[PDB]
Structures are given as C-alpha cells and as structure tokens.
Design goal:
The complex is a heterotetramer, with two copies of chain A (11 residues) and two copies of chain C (240 residues). Chain A is mostly helical and 11 residues long. Helices cover 64% and strands 0% of the residues of chain A. Chain C has 240 residues and is mainly alpha-helical. A three-stranded antiparallel β-sheet of chain C has the order 1-2-3. The chains are: A mainly alpha (11), C mainly alpha (240). Bound molecules: the ligand C=C1/C(=C\C=C2/CCC[C@]3(C)C(=C=CCCCC(C)(C)O)CC[C@@H]23)C[C@@H](O)C[C@@H]1O (2 copies). Chains A, B: It comes from Homo sapiens (Human).
Chain lengths: 11, 11, 240, 240
Amino acid sequence: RHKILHRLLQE
Amino acid sequence: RHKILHRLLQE
Amino acid sequence: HMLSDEQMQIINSLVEAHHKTYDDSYSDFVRFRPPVRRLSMLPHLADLVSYSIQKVIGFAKMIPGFRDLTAEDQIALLKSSAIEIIMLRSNQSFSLEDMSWSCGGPDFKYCINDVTKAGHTLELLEPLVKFQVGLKKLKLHEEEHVLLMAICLLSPDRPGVQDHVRIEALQDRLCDVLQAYIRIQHPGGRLLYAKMIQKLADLRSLNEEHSKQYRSLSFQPEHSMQLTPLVLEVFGSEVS
Amino acid sequence: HMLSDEQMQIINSLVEAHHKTYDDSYSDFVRFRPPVRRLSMLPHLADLVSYSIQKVIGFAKMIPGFRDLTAEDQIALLKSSAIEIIMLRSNQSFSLEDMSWSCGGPDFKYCINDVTKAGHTLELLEPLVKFQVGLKKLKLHEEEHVLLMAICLLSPDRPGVQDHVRIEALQDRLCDVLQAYIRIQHPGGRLLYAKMIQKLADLRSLNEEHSKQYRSLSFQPEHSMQLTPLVLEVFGSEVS
Ligand SMILES: C=C1/C(=C\C=C2/CCC[C@]3(C)C(=C=CCCCC(C)(C)O)CC[C@@H]23)C[C@@H](O)C[C@@H]1O
Ligand SMILES: C=C1/C(=C\C=C2/CCC[C@]3(C)C(=C=CCCCC(C)(C)O)CC[C@@H]23)C[C@@H](O)C[C@@H]1O
C-alpha cells in the first residue's frame, strides 16, 4: 500500500 | 490477481 | 518593493532542491532500457518517467513545509501532480529549434513520434507540445521555474487531500514570493504572473488526458508489464 | 526396445517448443537494462529473469496436456517451478571452461560475483554453480534436456495444485519416455536416469534457498522497485 512511496518519502 | 500470467497463458 | 529575508530563503532552498534533483548531464539515461524506433518506445519512456518520479519526490521533500505534512497528504499531492511536475521540469530539455526534448545525444532526443510509440496519441501530444513551446517562450528565470513547480505541487484542489487549509497557506506563501520576484527582479514581467497561473490550468487538462490514455495502457497486461513498479504505484488508482 | 509413435511425437513437440522459446543468438539481451559491475547488477538480472519467465511460459503452453489443465493449476505449476526451469535452461549457456554463463559478449558473461551484486549470497550461488557443473558433465542430449524441463514443470508435489492425479499421470508419461530414450538412444546412459532425477531434488533445494533470499530482497522497497511486474507476480506470495 504505497510501499515504494512511503520508503522514498522517509529519511 | 495473476493478471500478467492469465494474459500470457491464453491465446 | 523588495523581497524579505524569509522569502529569499524560500527561493534559495527551492533552487538548491532543483539543482540536487536535476542533472544536466543526463548520464543516468544510459541505465534505462534502450529506446527502440508494437509500442517499442514504452520500455525506455517508462524508465524515463519512473526515474523522473524519483526526482520529483526528492524535490518535494526539500520544499519548505511539505515534509511537515502528514504522510497521506504528501502521497495525495505526489500522485495527482507527478505527471504535471514532470511536464513542467521537462521544459528544461525542450528546444524550440527542434520541437523536441534533447537530453544529450540522438538516442535521447524524443520527438512526438517517439511518444506515439509508447501508447499515446496526438490528442495528448499536440497540447503537450503546444504547452512546452509557450512555456519556453515565457523565458522563465530559474527562480520562477522552480517556484512554479512548487506551487503546482502544493495545490489544494487535488483528490485525496485532507488538510486543505494547511496546504493552501503554503501555496499562497509561494505565490506571494513569485509575484514579488517577478515584480522586482523581472523587467517587463508585468503580465507574466497571469501567464504562469494559466499554465497551471493547462497542466490540469494535460493531466486529465494522460490519465485517460494511461488507463487504457494499464488495462492491457502485455503493456502494463513493461511499466515499472513505481510508475504503477504512483499512477495507480489505489487510495489511502 | 524402441520408442512408440506417440512417444516420439512427445519428444518432437518438446524439442520444437524449446527451439521456439530459446534463441541462441541472445540478441534480445541488448533490450535489458545494461549490466553494471549497491546491487548494481539487480536491474539487468531482473530483466534477464523476467524475460526468461516469459520463455518458460511459452515452453509450458506447448507441452502436451499442460494447456488442458485448469488455469489455476497452470499458474501454481509455473509459480513454484519458474526459477527451477530457468536454472535448468541456463545450463545451455553455462561453460565449464569459464565457470560462468556466456551469452554472446563480455557484457553478457555472468559470473558468481555478478549475481552477488544482485542481492544474493554464496549459500545460494555455491550450490547453483555446483548444480550447473554436474548437470553439464551429464552431457544430456537435447531430447533429454527438454524432457527434464517438462518433467520438472509437471511435478505434482508443488504448492497450490488441485488435480494431483491428472498432472501426475502426465509426469509419469514423460518419465517413461525419458527412461526409454536413454535406454535405446543413449549409449552408456545406464546410470543417467537416476542422476537426472537427483538433479530434480537439487532443484528443490536451490528453489527453497532462492525464495528465502528473494523474500529479503522483496521486503526492501528500494530493491523491489528495481524488479519487473512479471517477476513480482510470479515470485510473489499471492495464492489463487
Ligand atoms: C521527464 C523528463 C524529460 C522528458 C519528458 C518528456 C518527453 C518524452 C515524453 C514525456 C515523458 C511525457 C509523456 C508521456 C509518455 C510517458 C507516460 C506513460 C507512457 C508512462 O504513461 C510527458 C513529459 C515528456 C527529460 C528531461 O527534461 C527530464 C524530465 O524529467
Ligand atoms: C536465465 C537464463 C540465463 C542465465 C541464468 C543465470 C545466470 C545469472 C544468474 C541466474 C539468473 C539466477 C539467479 C538468481 C539471480 C536473479 C534472481 C532475482 C534477483 C530476480 O531474485 C539463476 C539462473 C542464473 C542465460 C541463458 O541461459 C537463458 C536462461 O534463461
């Protein structure tokens, strides 16, 4: 669920 | 749900 | 009749964020699936778009205030505006002389015919090229180019946003900076701000048409299998 | 003391199916993301595996009886055995002199170090290379190579299969053909059938180890984003 977006959005 | 497999498996 | 310190800091942080996420050498393009000239350009252009989405995410994370939003609003803003920022940032490689995007070499020179070989039609590509030429004719300063990308990304009128007042206040603060910059630093830019806001409206129309043609592309598994996981996630219809 | 007509037809249809899905020129490899020598080889090897999965599917569709199975059993057999058939079919490019896979050029010559740069470790690559060398030493006839891939694919002891008796009967018919071929057409192959069945057991061990290391690769989104949709679908844990 928006897995790649969550990873890219964090530090 | 196995969308690419279903397409590739049919004619 | 002059910008404040807090406003020039916004300009500085935005310009640096763009210099960190846009490489003028285009040396990373060799890592994409090579261009082929059915839908022979889809693999290369899918990698190009996917790579550009990562850059837009990196640019967004350095906009003042965007990172303080909830993770859901950040995703909603990115999913709806990703294709628009890509069209905006691509003007840097667009050339009026060639009417195409030149990214360092004939293999990385993309014309209208190249995008048709990626599943798209002229009803999207004609307004797209007609969008790039007048945006190029505006001859924006780099400060104005990056402000317009930031304003476009922080738009409140996008599906899925929850904190309408928090993001609208951010976008309003960026618009005042843009108006003030053009006023003070851009001679003859008296009609420029209105022309820049109009380009945002054109982007909404380009966004709607791309989503229609992407949906037809993504509903055929033989074509959607050529896309990347990031493209499928960002352009997908999943809602948080 | 000789094969029947129905059995030599099985051999013919299997050899033709392999010639239609295995191109000895390797000219399609130029369309993959180029090899780079963290995890710099993952993009190229992910495209290599994804491309090979499409070939294994095409090979499977031409095996006698496989296409008459339900769509669910076909998927269950393909999902569990895809990586094994790929390891099996890759022996055609494996070379004992180089201890590597040579696919026409130095850029497409894959050694053990190249696969470590795709997220895998020696606890999978040591048995893998130790699997390729003894399979190469068996010096299988092409008729035996393709029969072994068919037998491996039509295994009943795989998760998700429903028609255990229908697929076991197919696999038994292919095994009798293989035994009879080696008996009649392969001099000195007296111990060969047992050695070929043992390689199937080794493939199960190689399959288990690859799934463990793939799971760690697929749980990190920065790595799973470099995979292809077909790889994610075939190696994924979705059950029908
Ligand atoms: C990206 C960037 C560039 C080009 C963008 C283009 C030209 C090719 C066609 C593109 C990529 C577009 C389109 C539609 C085709 C791809 C969409 C698909 C098929 C995935 O749905 C809109 C923007 C257009 C190159 C460079 O400016 C970086 C920028 O960042
Ligand atoms: C494929 C084929 C070939 C090579 C296969 C190899 C060598 C490289 C490493 C490979 C691809 C393997 C592995 C693991 C790494 C990739 C798995 C990952 C990272 C996606 O999980 C098992 C088989 C090995 C080339 C040719 O023989 C066609 C065949 O069809």
